[PDB]
C-alpha cells in the first residue's frame, strides 16, 4: 500500500482529535440549529442548556427520552470527550447513541429533537463517527430542511455517494435518486440490519414504513427488465418480508404484503415459495386491516403461478390455517363484492381443497362456483375430482346438486370428464 | 524408451489434472502443489509463478498430494514418493498390490489408505528425522467397522489419533496402539468430503445430497446441518482470517459461502469450473488471509479475494462479494496444433479440441492467455486443423492464418 | 467509617468522577429502553517437557485457543419462519420454464437453423 493510502487511514482515525486550532473550528462549526460563525461562538454549556430543556419537552411526549438524561444529557457529560475514552468505553457510548437516534427517528418533525441532537453533534461528534446511523435514521425526512443541513456538515460514507450531489445544494434530493442508493445491493443489506434493529424493538413507525414500501417496490420496478438482478434481490427483500410478518404490528405485516405482491408479478416464483408465503402471512394474521390485505395478497400470488399444479388443492396444514383465519363466510363476502380481484386460480385450488378434506363444506362449494366464474380448464379439474368423490364418498343431495349445477352450465363437458374418467 | 538425444523437461499449459491440490507455507511464502498427469508443479500464491517441478515422471499417475513445509508426499499405484523441491529423496513402497488413495501426515506419522480399506502407518526412525520412513504398523478397517474410506484426517490436539472418514460413518483410530477407540453414529447419506474445522473436535462432512455436517467428535453428536438440496459437495474449507466463513464447493461448479455466525448465505459463485469436468474439485481458504484458491478438472486454477467491507459500522453485515484476483489455466482438451511464436522462444501458440487458441509462456512466469475471438467490423470458432505464423511483420498487420474443420474459409489472427 | 450517600454525590461532582455514567452506559440494553472416546494409552503415556498425557492435552488444548480465537457459532447449536427456511435451502428462485406451458412474456428463446 502507498504511504498516502496508509496515511489517509491515519487521518480518518484522528478525525475528531482537534489537535490544533484549525481542526477545532471545523469540528465545532458543524451545527444543526445555527450557522458556522455563530456556532464557533456558542459554548458547550450554552448548547447543553438548550439541549437539556429540549429533552424535557421530548420526555413529556415520550417518557423513554428521560433515560438519556441520566446517561447522555447529564451535567457530567459536558466534561466527557470521546478522544480520551478507552476502547471498551466507546461501544457502550456508541450503543447509547444508536438507541437515541432510534427514538429521534419518529420525532424529527418536532423542533425539540433538533436541539437535543445538537448536543450529540457538538459533544460526541456523531456526524463524524456515527455518520451512517444518523443518516440512516433520517432517510424519510429527505425533503425536510433538516436532511439538507445534515448533508452539509456530514461526510458521506462510500455507500451514500449518490447524495454527494445534493451536499450544500439548493435543491433537495429528488424522488428518483434514493432508488439508485437503494438499488445498490450492499446498502440494502446495510439497511436491512437497521430495519431488523427496529423490528426487534418495535421501532417501526408509519412514516418510516411508507417510505420503505415504496422503495423496495420501486427497486423491483427499476430492475424488472434485468432478470438475474431480480434473482439476487430474492434473498434480501423476502427475508425482510418474513421479518415484517413476524412483527405483531399490523403496519409491519401490511408492509410485507405490498412487497410480496409486487415482486410476484415482477418475478414468477416456485410454488413452494408461494405456499410458504401463505403460512408466514397467516401465522401472525390478527389485525382487521391486515387480514383484508392478506386475503387480497393471497389471491394475487396464485395469479402469478403459471405451472402445473397452478390450481391444485392446498396442503392440509395450509388449508386448515386458511379456514381458521378466513371462515367460509368471509370468502363468500370476498366473492360477493363486484370489485373483487381475479382469484379464479385460488378458488379452484380452494374448492379442490374442500373436497379432499371437508365433506360438510360441499354445499358451500356450490355457492362459490355461482358467485365467481371459473376458467374452463379450472371447471374441468373441479369436475374431475368430484367424479372421484361420487365413487368414493357417499352420494349426497349437495353432491348430486354439484353435478346438476354442471348439468345446467355446459352440459356437454360434464360428459367429457365422465368419458375420460369412467 | 530412453532417447540418446532427448529427455523430458516439463509440461506446459496444464495447471491441474483434477486431483485435489495441496497447500502449504514456506516461511512467509505460500505455495500450491498441483498434479499434472505423472508430474506435479508448485506455484507461488503471491503471483502464481511456478517454483519447482518434478525431476522425473512417476511410473504411475499420482492419485493424491500432501504438502508439508519443504516436503510433498505423492502417491502413485502402491508406492508413496517423498519429494523435496521436486527432487526424489526417499520412496515408500507398500507391501500389498492395493493402490493408495488417501494420505495423511501429522507429526512423525505417515498414513496411507489403500482400496482394500487397509491403512498403512509409517513412523520416523529418529525424532529429528525429516520425513517418516520406518513402517510402524498396519490398521485395516473391515466392512462391519465401516464403509469405504472417504479420506484420512487428523484433528488438532489429538495424541496419535487418526480420524478415518468412511462413506458409512467416521472412525477414530489410535495409530500408536492400532485400536478403534470410537465409532461415530451411522449417517443416512454417503459422505464425500471431510475437512477439519479451525474449531476444536469439530470436523465438517459433505454428503452426496447437499448436506454439510459440523459433527463434533467430543460430544459424538451433530452440532449443525446446512442444506443444499439437489447438490453434491466436492470440497469444504473455513476462513481463518477472523471471520467465520465456510466455503462449500459442489460438483455442479458452484462455490457457496455461508456466514456461519449469521446462519446466512454471503454469496454464491456460479459456474467457476465446468460441471462436465467435475465442477469444483478443490477449494481451500488460505491460512490467515481472505484469499481462497479454487481448482477443477477443466485445467484451471483460480484465486478470489474478499474486499474489506465498505461500511464503517456493521462491517460483518456488508460483506463485499468475491473478486477475480489472478488465475492460471489452459486447454480443457488435448492440443491439436502447436507452434513456436518467436525466435527468442518465450511464447507458444496452441490450439485444442475445445475451440480455443491459447498462448503459453515457457518461463517461470507461467503466463497464459486466450486470444480474443471478438470480431472486427468492416460461440467459439470450429476446430483449428492447420496454422502458420510469421514474425517479419509483427505490429503492422495480421501474421497468423488458421484453417478450421468443415469450413470453407480461413481466419487471421494478430499475435 | 464509609462515606454517606450524600457525600458520594458531592464527591462525584467535585472530582469529575464519571464511573457511574459508564456503568449505566455499559448496562444500557436497547430492549429495556423500549468421553465419547476413552483411550487408556493417553492416561498412561508420559511425555517429556515429564507431564501426564491428559494434563498435557489440556495445556495443548489451552495452547490452541490462544492461537485461534473461538468463534461464536460453535457455542450455538403455521410456522412464521418458513420463508427464512426456504430461502436458505435454495439459491435458485426462478420457477423452471421447462414445466411452464406458457412461454415467457418478454424473453423469447429462439435459435437459428
Amino acid at each position: 500500500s502507498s504511504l498516502s493510502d496508509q496515511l489517509a487511514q491515519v487521518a480518518s482515525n484522528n478525525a475528531t482529535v482537534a489537535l490544533d486550532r484549525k481542526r477545532r473550528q471545523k469540528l465545532h462549526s458543524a451545527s444543526l440549529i445555527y450557522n458556522s460563525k455563530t456556532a464557533a461562538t456558542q459554548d458547550y454549556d450554552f448548547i447543553f442548556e438548550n439541549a437539556s430543556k429540549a429533552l424535557e419537552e421530548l420526555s413529556q411526549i415520550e417518557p423513554k427520552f428521560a433515560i438519556f438524561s441520566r446517561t447522555l444529557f447529564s451535567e457530567s457529560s459536558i466534561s466527557l470527550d470521546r478522544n480520551v475514552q478507552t476502547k471498551e468505553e466507546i461501544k457502550d457510548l456508541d450503543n447509547a447513541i444508536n438507541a437515541y437516534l432510534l427514538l429521534a427517528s419518529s420525532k424529527w418533525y418536532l423542533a425539540p429533537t433538533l436541539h437535543a441532537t445538537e448536543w450529540l453533534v457538538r459533544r460526541f461528534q456523531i456526524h463524524v463517527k456515527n455518520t451512517e446511523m444518523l443518516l440512516l435514521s433520517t432517510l424519510n425526512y429527505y425533503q425536510t430542511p433538516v436532511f439538507k443541513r445534515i448533508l452539509s456538515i456530514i461526510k458521506l460514507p462510500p455507500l451514500f455517494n449518490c447524495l454527494s450531489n445534493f451536499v450544500r445544494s439548493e435543491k433537495p434530493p429528488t424522488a428518483l435518486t434514493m432508488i439508485k442508493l437503494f438499488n445498490d445491493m450492499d446498502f440494502l443489506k446495510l439497511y436491512t440490519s437497521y430495519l431488523d434493529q427496529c423490528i426487534k424493538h418495535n421501532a417501526t413507525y408509519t412514516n418510516q414504513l411508507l417510505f420503505t414500501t415504496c422503495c423496495f417496490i420501486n427497486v423491483v420496478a427499476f430492475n424488472s427488465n434485468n432478470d438475474e438482478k431480480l434473482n439476487q434481490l430474492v434473498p434480501i427483500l423476502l427475508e425482510i418480508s418474513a421479518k415484517l410478518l413476524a412483527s405483531k404490528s399490523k403496519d409491519c405485516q401490511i408492509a410485507a404484503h405490498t412487497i410480496l405482491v409486487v415482486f410476484a408479478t415482477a418475478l414468477p416464483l416456485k410454488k413452494t415459495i408461494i405456499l410458504a408465503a401463505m403460512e408466514t402471512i397467516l401465522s401472525n394474521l390478527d389485525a382487521k386491516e391486515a387480514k383484508h390485505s392478506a386475503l387480497l395478497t393471497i389471491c394475487k400470488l396464485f395469479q402469478t403461478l403459471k405451472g402445473q399444479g397452478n390450481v391444485d388443492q392446498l396442503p392440509s396444514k395450509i388449508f386448515k390455517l386458511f379456514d381458521s383465519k378466513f371462515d367460509t363466510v368471509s370468502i363468500l363476502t370476498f366473492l360477493d363484492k363486484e370489485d373483487k380481484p381475479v382469484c379464479d386460480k385460488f378458488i379452484t385450488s380452494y374448492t379442490r381443497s374442500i373436497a379432499r378434506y371437508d365433506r360438510s363444506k360441499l354445499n358451500i362449494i356450490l355457492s362459490l362456483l355461482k358467485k365467481i366464474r371459473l376458467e374452463r380448464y379450472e371447471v374441468r379439474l373441479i369436475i374431475t375430482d368430484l367424479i372421484y368423490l361420487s365413487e368414493i364418498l357417499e352420494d349426497k343431495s349437495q353432491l348430486v346438486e354439484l353435478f346438476e349445477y354442471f348439468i345446467s352450465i355446459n352440459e356437454d363437458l360434464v360428459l367429457k370428464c365422465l368419458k375420460s374418467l369412467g | 524408451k530412453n532417447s540418446k538425444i532427448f529427455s523430458p523437461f516439463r509440461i506446459i499449459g496444464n495447471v491441474s489434472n483434477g486431483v485435489p491440490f495441496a497447500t502449504g507455507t514456506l516461511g512467509s511464502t505460500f505455495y500450491i502443489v498441483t498434479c499434472v498427469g505423472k508430474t506435479f508443479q508448485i506455484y507461488d500464491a503471491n503471483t502464481l509463478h511456478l517454483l519447482f517441478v518434478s525431476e522425473k515422471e512417476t511410473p504411475s499417475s499420482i492419485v493424491a498430494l500432501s504438502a508439508h513445509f519443504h516436503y510433498v508426499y505423492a502417491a502413485y499405484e502402491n508406492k508413496v514418493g517423498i519429494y523435496k523441491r521436486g527432487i526424489e529423496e526417499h520412496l515408500l513402497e507398500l507391501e500389498t498390490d492395493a493402490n493408495v488413495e488417501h494420505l495423511c501426515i501429522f507429526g512423525d506419522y505417515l498414513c496411507a489408505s489403500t482400496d482394500d480399506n487397509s491403512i498403512f502407518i509409517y513412523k520416523k526412525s529418529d525424532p529429528q528425522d525429516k520425513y517418516p520412513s520406518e513402517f510402524y504398523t498396519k490398521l485395516t478397517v473391515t466392512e462391519i467397522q465401516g464403509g469405504e474410506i472417504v479420506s484420512l484426517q487428523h484433528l488438532a490436539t489429538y495424541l496419535n489419533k487418526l480420524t478415518v472418514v468412511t462413506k458409512s460413518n467416521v472412525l477414530l483410530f489410535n495409530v500408536r496402539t492400532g485400536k478403534l477407540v470410537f465409532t461415530s453414529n451411522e449417517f443416512p447419506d454417503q459422505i464425500t468430503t471431510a475437512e477439519p474445522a479451525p474449531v476444536l473436535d469439530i470436523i465438517a462432512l459433505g454428503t452426496v445430497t447437499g448436506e454439510v455436517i459440523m459433527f463434533n467428535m467430543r460430544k459424538g453428536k451433530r452440532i449443525r446441518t446446512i442444506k443444499i438440496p439437489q447438490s453434491r459437495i466436492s470440497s469444504l474449507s473455513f476462513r481463518t482470517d477472523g471471520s467465520s466463513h465456510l466455503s462449500v464447493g459442489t460438483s455442479s461448479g458452484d462455490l457457496i459461502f455461508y456466514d456461519l455466525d449469521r446462519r446466512s448465505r454471503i454469496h454464491v459463485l456460479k459456474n467457476i469450473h465446468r460441471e462436465s469436468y467435475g465442477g469444483v474439485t478443490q477449494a481451500t481458504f488460505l491460512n490467515g488471509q481472505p484469499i481462497i484458491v479454487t481448482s477443477g478438472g477443466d485445467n484451471s486454477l483460480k484465486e478470489y479475494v474478499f474486499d474489506p467491507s465498505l461500511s464503517q459500522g456493521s462491517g460483518d453485515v456488508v460483506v463485499q462479494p468475491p473478486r477475480y484476483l489472478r488465475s492460471r489455466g489452459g486447454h480443457s482438451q488435448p492440443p491439436s496444433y502447436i507452434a513456436f511464436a518467436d525466435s527468442q522462444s518465450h511464447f507458444m501458440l496452441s490450439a485444442s479440441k475445445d475451440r480455443s487458441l491459447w498462448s503459453f509462456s515457457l518461463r517461470k512466469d507461467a503466463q497464459s492467455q486466450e486470444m480474443s475471438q471478438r470480431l472486427h467490423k468492416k460461440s467459439k470458432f470450429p476446430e483449428i486443423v492447420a496454422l502458420a505464423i510469421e514474425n517479419a511483420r509483427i505490429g503492422e498487420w495480421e501474421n497468423i492464418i488458421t484453417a478450421h474443420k468443415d469450413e470453407k474459409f480461413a481466419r487471421t489472427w494478430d499475435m | 467509617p464509609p462515606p454517606d450517600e450524600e457525600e458520594q454525590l458531592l464527591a462525584k461532582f467535585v472530582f469529575g468522577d464519571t464511573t457511574d455514567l459508564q456503568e449505566n452506559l455499559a448496562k444500557f440494553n436497547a430492549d429495556f429502553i423500549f468421553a465419547a472416546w476413552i483411550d487408556s494409552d493417553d492416561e498412561k503415556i508420559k511425555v517429556p517437557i515429564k507431564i501426564n498425557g491428559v494434563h498435557y492435552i489440556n495445556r495443548l488444548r489451552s495452547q490452541f485457543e490462544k492461537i485461534y480465537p473461538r468463534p461464536k457459532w460453535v457455542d450455538d447449536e403455521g410456522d412464521i419462519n418458513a420463508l427464512t427456511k426456504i430461502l436458505s435451502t435454495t439459491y435458485n428462485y426462478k420457477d423452471t420454464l421447462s414445466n411452464s406451458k406458457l412461454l415467457p412474456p418478454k424473453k423469447l428463446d429462439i435459435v437459428r437453423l
Binding site: 500500500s1 493510502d5 462510500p158 455507500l159 455517494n161 449518490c162 454527494s164 450531489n165 445498490d184 450492499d186 | 507455507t25 516461511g27 512467509s28 505460500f30 500464491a45 503471491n46 501426515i105 501429522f106 507429526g107 512423525d108 506419522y109 487428523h154 488438532a156 490436539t157 489429538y158 495424541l159 496419535n160 481463518t240 488460505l286 491460512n287 490467515g288 488471509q289 481472505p290 484469499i291 479475494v305 474486499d307 465498505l310 463485499q320 473478486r323 484476483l325 | 495443548l60 495452547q63 490452541f64 492461537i67 485461534y68
Partner: peptide, 24 residues
C-alpha cells in the same frame, strides 16, 4: 455519481498455525 469500488491490492501476512508434532 456511481458508487466507487476500489480494487487496491492484497498482500498476505504470516499467521501462527498449530504444529502437528506436538500431536505426535
Amino acid at each position: 455519481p456511481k458508487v466507487v469500488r476500489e480494487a487496491k491490492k492484497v498482500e498476505m501476512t504470516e499467521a501462527r498455525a498449530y504444529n502437528a508434532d506436538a500431536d505426535t
